[PDB]
């Protein structure tokens, strides 16, 4: 019943989260983009099986190593439908549910960072969130495929999930998330203590994840495109008048770019 989720670190900044079930010994991954960490944590719990591999989207440091797990260990392979997902065995549409370690996951499609990404939704007292590189701490990922209203749109959908629903993204990009966040709220002050804590767990070398929606609510900048001081600073930016809140999110989404 109890399930441990660590993060096992992967390239530069990646995590691929290890979903585990230690009573019945079977583990489950998401985006393993390297299978090499999952081959030794395998090799170090040999009793155990790799059940399901969960993929969000396409690209490259999420789906580098599921073919080379399924051959090794038969798991399952889920991957969001309308993209290529190596050795995939469940095509996921919005609005379907699957099971995984016996977790209930609700599908949803969330366009932005790739036309297809999707993300794993776990209802319960506390939810899980496993929502790959569209929603960042503190931050959300670049326009890859996806227009700003298909972005935006995403990202309210996961804001309006339950408050303390646990924010598992894929990579560690806390610190750089948070230092654009202070240009486009100075005056934050939740936002600053948010930094300097982020500041703290780097300078140890400990993980940033998984974040809190409530937390992103009130310091994620492109989650406050509604706040009247997040859309002061970006006519400030763009010089323009952004009326709609999809118009202040494209505005900050292309300022990051280039920060
Ligand atoms: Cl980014
Ligand atoms: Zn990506
Ligand atoms: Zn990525």
Redesign the pocket.
């Known amino acids: 019943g109890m399930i441990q989720i660590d993060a096992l670190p992967a390239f530069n900044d990646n995590y691929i989260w290890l979903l585990q079930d230690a009573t019945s010994r079977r583990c489950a991954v998401v985006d393993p983009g390297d299978a090499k960490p999952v081959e030794a944590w395998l090799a170090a719990h040999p009793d155990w099986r790799l059940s399901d591999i969960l993929v969000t989207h396409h690209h490259h440091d999420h789906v580098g190593g599921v073919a080379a797990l399924k051959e090794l260990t038969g798991a399952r392979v889920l991957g969001p439908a309308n993209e290529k997902i190596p050795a995939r065995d469940l095509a996921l549409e919005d609005g379907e549910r699957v099971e995984v370690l016996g977790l209930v996951f609700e599908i949803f499609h969330v366009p932005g960072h790739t036309l297809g990404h999707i993300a794993y939704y776990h209802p319960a007292e506390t939810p899980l969130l496993f929502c790959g590189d569209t929603l ?1 701490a503190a ?4 326009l890859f495929e996806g227009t700003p209203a298909q972005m935006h749109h995403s990202l309210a959908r996961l804001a309006a999930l339950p408050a303390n629903t646990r924010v598992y993204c894929t990579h560690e ?1 806390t610190l ?2 948070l230092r654009f966040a202070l240009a486009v709220e100075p005056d934050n002050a939740a936002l600053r203590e948010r930094f300097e804590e982020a500041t703290r767990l780097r300078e140890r070398d400990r993980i940033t994840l998984p974040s809190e929606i409530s937390l992103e609510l009130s310091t994620n900048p492109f989650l406050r495109v509604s706040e009247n001081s997040v859309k002061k600073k970006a006519d400030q930016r763009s010089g323009q008048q952004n009326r709609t809140p999809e118009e202040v999110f494209a505005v900050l989404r292309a300022w ?2 280039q920060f």
């Open positions: 960042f931050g959300c990922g670049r990009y750089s998330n990051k770019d």
